[PDB]
Amino acid sequence: VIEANLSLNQNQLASNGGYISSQLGIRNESCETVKFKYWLSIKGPEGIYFPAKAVVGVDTAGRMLNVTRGFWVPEYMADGKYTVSLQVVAENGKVFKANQEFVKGVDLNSLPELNGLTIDIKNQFGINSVESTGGFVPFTVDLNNGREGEANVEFWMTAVGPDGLIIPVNAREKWVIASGDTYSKVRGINFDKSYPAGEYTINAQVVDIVSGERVEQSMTVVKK
Amino acid sequence: PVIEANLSLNQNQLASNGGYISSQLGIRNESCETVKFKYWLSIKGPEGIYFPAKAVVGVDTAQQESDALTDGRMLNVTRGFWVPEYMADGKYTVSLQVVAENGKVFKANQEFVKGVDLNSLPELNGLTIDIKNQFGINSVESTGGFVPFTVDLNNGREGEANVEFWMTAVGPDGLIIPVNAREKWVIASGDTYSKVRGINFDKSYPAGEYTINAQVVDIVSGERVEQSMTVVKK
Numbered sequence: 167v168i169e170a171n172l173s174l175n176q177n178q179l180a181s182n183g184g185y186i187s188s189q190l191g192i193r194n195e196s197c198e199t200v201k202f203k204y205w206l207s208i209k210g211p212e213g214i215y216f217p218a219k220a221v222v223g224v225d226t227a228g229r230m231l232n233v234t235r236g237f238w239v240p241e242y243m244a245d246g247k248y249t250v251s252l253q254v255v256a257e258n259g260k261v262f263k264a265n266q267e268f269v270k271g272v273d274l275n276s277l278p279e280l281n282g283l284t285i286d287i288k289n290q291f292g293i294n295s296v297e298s299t300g301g302f303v304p305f306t307v308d309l310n311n312g313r314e315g316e317a318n319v320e321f322w323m324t325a326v327g328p329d330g331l332i333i334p335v336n337a338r339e340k341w342v343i344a345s346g347d348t349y350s351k352v353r354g355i356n357f358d359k360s361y362p363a364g365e366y367t368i369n370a371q372v373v374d375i376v377s378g379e380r381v382e383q384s385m386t387v388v389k390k
Numbered sequence: 391p392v393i394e395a396n397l398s399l400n401q402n403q404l405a406s407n408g409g410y411i412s413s414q415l416g417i418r419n420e421s422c423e424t425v426k427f428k429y430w431l432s433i434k435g436p437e438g439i440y441f442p443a444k445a446v447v448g449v450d451t452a453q454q455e456s457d458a459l460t461d462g463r464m465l466n467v468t469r470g471f472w473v474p475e476y477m478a479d480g481k482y483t484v485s486l487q488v489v490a491e492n493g494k495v496f497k498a499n500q501e502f503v504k505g506v507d508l509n510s511l512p513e514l515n516g517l518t519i520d521i522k523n524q525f526g527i528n529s530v531e532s533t534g535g536f537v538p539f540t541v542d543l544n545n546g547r548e549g550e551a552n553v554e555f556w557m558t559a560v561g562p563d564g565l566i567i568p569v570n571a572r573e574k575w576v577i578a579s580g581d582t583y584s585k586v587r588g589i590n591f592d593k594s595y596p597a598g599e600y601t602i603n604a605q606v607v608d609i610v611s612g613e614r615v616e617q618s619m620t621v622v623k624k
């Protein structure tokens with residue numbers, strides 16, 4: 167019905183930021199013509215959300231839409247990982263999204279880290295959705311202390327979902343991790359049948375309580 | 391309304407060094423029959439902070455377990471949490487949330503502040519930020535509606551303020567809808583920048599909660615302040 171595609175000309179910025187040029191493709195492939203609205207937005211660390219392209223309505227009367235849109239990422243924005251999202255909502259309510267990530271001030275293919283303490287938190291089996299009748303999704307957590315000295319860390323997780331829900335996934339834990347050691351666990355969330363349908367962001371936070379620096383890791387699961 | 395939830399905090403104002411907040415949680419069954427539900431207490435704060443009220447000494451292995459209340463009866467529990475110094479100064483929302491077995495959601499929220507005054511506008515060092523749902527429209531019909539917001543930035547500094555401003559609506563299905571494009575304003579000392587910007591919720595947008603999120607940046611100091619307001623599409 168609609169196929170959305172997003173390409174970024176570049177994916178890695180230095181700490182001072184820079185310019186990213188986006189190529190947007192929206193294809194109406196089906197037999198019927200289609201009306202939709204679309205826009206381009208960015209999500210980043212520290213609760214940053216910002217627009218790159220305003221809401222525009224399109225009636226494919228179908229064609230193929232190709233648009234280039236760039237945006238500046240200023241130095242003041244936090245170093246870390248950002249997600250650019252081309253979003254389309256069709257007249258019938260169907261939602262289509264094409265996302266791409268860029269990083270600022272950190273390496274694209276490295277684990278997030280707090281000055282030598284690396285944070286490896288993953289959706290263990292890559293389960294991106296669960297049935298409306300319920301399902302369970304396990305996550306792996308590995309905090310590896312690559313420093314010469316000990317790391318004093320705090321860790322927790324919530325599920326930020328529909329209807330303003332913020333569901334606890336992992337209570338606040340505190341660990342003193344020796345040099346060279348790793349804190350490892352697997353933690354799952356059971357999505358009970360009663361939880362509302364929609365998108366949940368599994369939000370993991372790790373803090374070095376000595377430096378006071380905090381790193382967040384966000385992972386999406388949809389309940390159908 | 392099967393369930394009635396209530397929350398109170400023992401204090402609503404912390405210094406920048408943080409502190410300890412005790413909460414009183416009340417969940418009453420108003421229905422004529424037994425109700426089964428799950429409930430939890432969570433906190434949302436500045437800089438994208440979200441955290442659960444619970445802290446454990448070792449490894450958290452607990453499940454989110456259901457409770458039940460027979461006709462007329464009530465659950466009263468107390469929960470406390472530490473707000474560490476490292477957490478950003480600003481406004482926090484504590485939310486008691488209840489999900490009944492039937493899928494119905496009930497919430498009771500209270501706010502506290504850390505390192506800022508309780509009854510004062512959000513501010514960037516003398517530049518105050520006053521952003522409001524203009525007519526107090528908290529929801530729109532599933533068939534669509536429009537909600538205007540007032541924006542007033544008062545520069546109480548001695549020199550001019552250089553700011554960047556934008557708004558989005560963070561909604562269901564991972565939507566982040568542009569509301570106000572990124573603009574840069576130069577505001578003289580003593581002046582107020584005022585505008586009105588609204589968002590049209592098209593009929594086609596998904597039902598559920600939208601957080602209208604306004605962000606203001608002092609582009610000289612690099613400091614950023616957010617203001618979040620909720621609109622529900624039925």
Ligand SMILES: [Cl-]
Pocket residue numbers: 408409410411
């Ligand atoms: Cl205290």
